[PDB]
Paper text:
Adeno-associated viruses (AAVs) are small non-enveloped viruses with a size of approximately 25 nm. They belong to the dependoparvovirus genus of the parvoviridae family and carry a 4.7-kb single-stranded DNA (ssDNA) genome. In this study, we present a novel capsid, AAVv128, which was generated through rational design and exhibits significant differences from its parental capsid, AAV8, despite a high sequence similarity of 99%. Here, we present a novel AAV capsid (AAVv128), which exhibits significantly enhanced transduction efficiency for photoreceptors and retinal pigment epithelial (RPE) cells, along with a broader distribution across the layers of retinal tissues in different animal models (mice, rabbits, and NHPs) following intraocular injection.
To characterize the structural properties of AAVv128, the purified AAVv128-eGFP vector was subjected to cryo-EM analysis. A total of 90,744 particle images were obtained, which allowed the generation of a cryo-EM map at 2.1 Å resolution. A comparison of the AAVv128 structure with that of AAV8 revealed a distinctive structural feature that may contribute to differences in capsid thermal stability and transduction ability. The AAVv128 and AAV8 structures were similar, except for the 3-fold protrusions (Root-mean-square deviation (RMSD) of 0.507 Å after superimposition of 516 Cα atoms; Fig. 6b, c). The 3-fold protrusions were more pronounced in AAVv128 due to the 5-amino acid insertion, which protruded radially outward from the capsid surface, forming a larger loop that had greater spatial flexibility. The 3-fold region, including the protrusions, contained receptor binding, infectivity and antigenicity controlling residues. In AAV8, only a few hydrogen bonds were formed between amino acid sequences in this loop, such as the interaction between the hydroxyl group of T591 and the backbone carbonyl of the symmetry-related Q588 (3.3 Å). In contrast, AAVv128 formed a large number of hydrogen bonds between amino acid sequences in this loop, including interactions between R588 to R596, Q593 to A595, among others. Within the amino acid sequence of AAVv128, R588 formed a strong interaction with R596, which appeared to stabilize this loop, acting as a zipper for the “pocket” loop. Furthermore, the amino acid sequence of AAVv128 loop was more positively charged, resulting in a 0.83 higher isoelectric point for the entire AAVv128, with a pI of 7.69 (compared to a pI of 6.86 for AAV8). L586 in AAVv128 interacted with R596, whereas L586 in AAV8 did not form such an interaction with the surrounding amino acids. These observations suggested that the transduction efficiency of AAVv128 at the animal level was substantially better than that of AAV8, potentially due to the charged nature and stability of this loop.
Author numbering:
A (entry chain 1), B (entry chain g), C (entry chain H): 218 to 743
The structure:
Amino acid sequence: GADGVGSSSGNWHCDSTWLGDRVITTSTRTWALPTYNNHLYKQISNGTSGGATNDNTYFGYSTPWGYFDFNRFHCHFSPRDWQRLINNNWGFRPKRLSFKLFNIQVKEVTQNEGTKTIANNLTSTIQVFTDSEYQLPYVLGSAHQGCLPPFPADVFMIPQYGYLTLNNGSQAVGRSSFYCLEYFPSQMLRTGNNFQFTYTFEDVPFHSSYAHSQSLDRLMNPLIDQYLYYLSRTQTTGGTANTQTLGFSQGGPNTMANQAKNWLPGPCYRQQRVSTTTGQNNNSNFAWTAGTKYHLNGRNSLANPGIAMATHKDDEERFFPSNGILIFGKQNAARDNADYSDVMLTSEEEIKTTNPVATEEYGIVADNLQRGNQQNTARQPQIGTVNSQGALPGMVWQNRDVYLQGPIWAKIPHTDGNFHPSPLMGGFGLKHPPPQILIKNTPVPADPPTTFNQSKLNSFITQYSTGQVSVEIEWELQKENSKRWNPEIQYTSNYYKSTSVDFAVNTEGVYSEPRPIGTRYLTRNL
Amino acid sequence: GADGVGSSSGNWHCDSTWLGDRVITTSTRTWALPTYNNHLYKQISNGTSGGATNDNTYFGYSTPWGYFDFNRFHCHFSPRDWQRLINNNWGFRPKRLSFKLFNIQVKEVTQNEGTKTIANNLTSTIQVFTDSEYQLPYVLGSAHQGCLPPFPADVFMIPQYGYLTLNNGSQAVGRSSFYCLEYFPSQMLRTGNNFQFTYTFEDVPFHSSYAHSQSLDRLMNPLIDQYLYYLSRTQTTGGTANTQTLGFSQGGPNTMANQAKNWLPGPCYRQQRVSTTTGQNNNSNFAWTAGTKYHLNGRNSLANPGIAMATHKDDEERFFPSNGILIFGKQNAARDNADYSDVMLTSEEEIKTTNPVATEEYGIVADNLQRGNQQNTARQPQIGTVNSQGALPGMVWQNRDVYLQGPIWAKIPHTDGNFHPSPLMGGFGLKHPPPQILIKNTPVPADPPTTFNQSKLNSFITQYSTGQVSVEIEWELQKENSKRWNPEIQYTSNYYKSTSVDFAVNTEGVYSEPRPIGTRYLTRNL
Amino acid sequence: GADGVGSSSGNWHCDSTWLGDRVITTSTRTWALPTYNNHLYKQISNGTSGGATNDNTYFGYSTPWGYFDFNRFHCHFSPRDWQRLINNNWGFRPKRLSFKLFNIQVKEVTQNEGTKTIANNLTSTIQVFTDSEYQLPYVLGSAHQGCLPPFPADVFMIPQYGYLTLNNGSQAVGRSSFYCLEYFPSQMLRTGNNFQFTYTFEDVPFHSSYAHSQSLDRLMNPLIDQYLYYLSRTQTTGGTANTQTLGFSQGGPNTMANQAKNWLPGPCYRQQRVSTTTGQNNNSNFAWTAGTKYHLNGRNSLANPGIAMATHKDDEERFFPSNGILIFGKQNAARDNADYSDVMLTSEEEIKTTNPVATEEYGIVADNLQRGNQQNTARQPQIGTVNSQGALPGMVWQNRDVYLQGPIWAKIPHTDGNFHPSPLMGGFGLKHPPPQILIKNTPVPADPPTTFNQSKLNSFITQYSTGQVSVEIEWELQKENSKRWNPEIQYTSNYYKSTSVDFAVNTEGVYSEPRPIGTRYLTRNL
């Protein structure tokens, strides 16, 4: 058509459409983009000279660009839409997305004395491009702030793009890369232009939006015996001097721990157990010294949250792995040293059926070769505790649950090999994820001098931009086909009276999410 | 055409053609083939009676055949061609090969008194066949001598084919197989015939001809905080009597070791650390007693080189895993007890970014369940060191690098299951690799007696054969598409003056390779 | 389409595409254009009255226009792209270019009291035209500041156009020309218009992007003697009284300086030798008194850098010709009297093979006619040193190398004759080079008086302009086809750790180039 100062370049479109095995969520927000870094790229680093430990060293670059992040589930689903999803579906996955950037408004700020004036700059541009070839460091999938807000009426600030590369302390090495984002083709938009692009998700397995109604060690028939035998006795009984013997029995309903089985629980990487009753915990600061870590290039990193393991066993909801769960913060919680009442701990107890408990061992194996007292001195069988266990043939396991406040996807690192590349924070591991959209205000110089100077211009017009952003994702559903007789467990609001509605604004206009909501409510058989 | 004594049956073809995403290397050499084993098959074995340990016992057969081996990279690539490959390509893999055997010359040796005469035997044959059905023990892929020489002007001797089967000490068992290679269809060639065959590689992943410019624990945005919380404090501070508490923080730029992450480093099988400064090593002979071994049927075998792990961490190039690297020998180095200055140690430091260091642990896991002093005696959290770690979900890793002097492929054992079947010595794991070409001089009996005798003939005419062999491999390239601004690291010759040119002959005509050359020079993002 | 205030008239396009024998570099920058000279043309001159010497006199005109200059190699090539070029190609040359000027923003500045306000002037224009007929003095190709910056994120100021004509001291002569650039057809652009033009380079020889692996005096076979003889002796030996004789020998492997040869080294114009170790230089200020100069119309001009000669011989990297090399300045170096550590000296040592050393003589010639003592007094042969040598038949030579920071082209003067018209600063000599693009802000008068006045208006509205400029050049490549066995020399980054990445921004956002990069890394035979 005809795009100009006086015409609108897009419409507000926030909705959700359920149709068959599909649900299409569309979302629109209003953003603001400042000028970052004074239009400069800056080398950033952190060494041990300052006072940091070797574990927190880095070397990277801070860019003047910003980026869009809709990598949380509440960016697309309302709390009621999340309820329709998790109460009626066994699984879901993303199919394709559309992204739009419209109604651009570039404004200039003047500051004579103590007066601040904001006026339109009708001829200024913003630059937008997507990293469709995955040529920049991918910083989505690290659970960073700056998402599209969950409440459609909130206006958000676009976060600043930065990246890291190889370091040796605060220094760089020969393989450290430097990226200029102006070295990419970018689209320039004045107040009358808009931007848009579409993306198609690759085939990714459905998320397991269910709990198991059987456990792995209870797949048997509780009425029939097994025809296989197991060693049930190595020493006679009854008499006064018991001797060695061999005795075998058939596993039945009363001895189900001895029965022969076909499968094994998933892998284990044991965590430390912490109680929410502080009086039960040890009186020391063991959050880091006793943490569950991995070692990479002489640098210790917390395995957080780590592989998917059950949070606790039966009747022990007060225990959690020290760094083995996702922890969200309540509305307006401190950044550092928030109290327990200010955060919301998740719980993966739904996978007790196949996954080992995060704070327990995997099992028991033998240590030595037992013998009698025939020739050499008698030796008693020794056993060892398996606290870490990699993949064994015949293992089955579930992934970590996704949450309304949690991440959606992550980029699978480009490596030679990987094992079960599902992100450890939960979500869909993608070889080619949604590309990151980079955005920036084109610099506008102030009046240059009237005599030539070779130096680069460092005096600019103060500016920022505003506009709307809409993202539409189509999800595929996996409906449940269950013959269970009794009613299921569902997610529900509390009927009782209260001061405020959950998932609503309070008297000051602050929207908040009172609890985290997983997706495992319906049940399945193993 | 017309093949006979006076016409040539092939041309010398040693070259390399780069065209697009393909490179075609052709190579020709001159070989000599003796008579092996006096035309006999011989049972060979080694037991503990002789003085060998149980780890080195074997039972097998020594055959009179020889075999062709072009399973090193310098058989096909010149040092300059290797430089064109590793400086410009992110990956490569083999596609198809052609093999030719031509200009056969069978010669007979007579030895009257102290006189030695060598004359043509125009009517003698050689036998050639390829094990296209993989019915013989495959001895390629064990890094054996007898390759086509790297320098095209060198004449090489064809190695003798032998194989092993099951043993119990120096003895055999009922499942031990005996193979006669004369029980195969074979092609007989006189001085005017030639042999040829073609082969097509199966789909194999490209070799990672790059290093990572990011590390796994540094995929985050260094400017933005995380919205997820982690347990940062379990004990109050400041006061005189500190009590238990729970405190949570958000991971940010300054605490990147505590941030939530999606992935884990690759598996670990810890090695012993040895320094090239001998004064730093322990004063004992621990090369075998402290080696990193695996146990199979009561036999210990060194895990050499083992799974792909980083050789050392930053600033520690003097350390290597005791048996975790490929070690090549310099030109004319001893077979036994060569000094350190006579060998060339490789280094896989390029995979510090995803793979754990070979001489370090994998990480830390919990040992016990910590508790306070509410009821039972207080217990402090205990941690354990993970020195071996199998595959965990969310692991990523790189393979071992390939070298100019290193092997190309290996045959994947025919088993029920395998995990990431990439050869541990580096290269391409193939279910059906290039078949082994077997070659032999047909026996020519001396004058038999004039009265019949049933005994097999054990008097033959002394003979050997000569000819040329050409092998042409087509490789597929994977070009780099990088937006890195600063220059890359490249492999380069030293500009400074020297007594000899590297990768050239010296004054005596001896060709040598001064250093090993890997393939990871360009960089990528994770 | 529809061009106006609210629509963008161009997109940011900074990229490089390698495809076969072509590489296409595109580059976009943001510029600022002030009002120059108060919209006036001004006669400028410099005589000896002021204090200048006769060598620095001039007469010319300063115009109110500005011009665009992309005549350096870093305007188009990133440091990594320069590495892809010089490591893999024997030669390159430019083919065609595209130029675009878009997103024009004309702004007006008001200055009431101590307050400065910058507002859009939507109805103001800029004027742009290209000198496609080469009718103005061509000031590109004089290595002037004001290029498009090497770092795409830098905003640059457009330089002011001026020119010189004939002078006699500070005065002009009858042949001195005066040019008004308003006497050209020019395109006027408001904030919604854009400008563009294309250009095709003429056929120019490829740049020699290689070094020679042979030298001119070593093209012989080192094993065979020559059949030609040379005079090897003019006096008998051995006896007590030696007499005159004639003795001839054949040139062989041991006397290669006496062998007959077909060619001669290139021309010479000897320079003065300066050491970078200051203690080795003479203790006097000889930079100008001992400089290597040419004389034109009673005016001395430094021959800088002069004809292409080798910088130094073997093992003498510390010596350079006093004014015979290109010298670039490090980031933020002084304009006058910069120390040696603030500049980067180039070195043309790669042409030792065909070109004479800049600080050495060309050779030796005879001075007199030698004779004996038969009649007149005996005379000994005299020799003279050739310090300058023009073109001789059978000469071969290389041009000067091009650098990443160096110039690309120059305009060949329109004369009756020229010898080897390749610019002495390095690059491509073009009869019709890329035309210079002239740009200016159209003057906007302030309020004129209400009574008529014939005087020209000298009160204007303060103004400047901003916009983007994109230039795309297509280069043709000349791939190397070498049979060299050993690896080549390549340009590479240093692997060692460092405080900053080379060719990247520092902590303050300042981009810098640490060293000059030539193009002669691969090798050829003579």
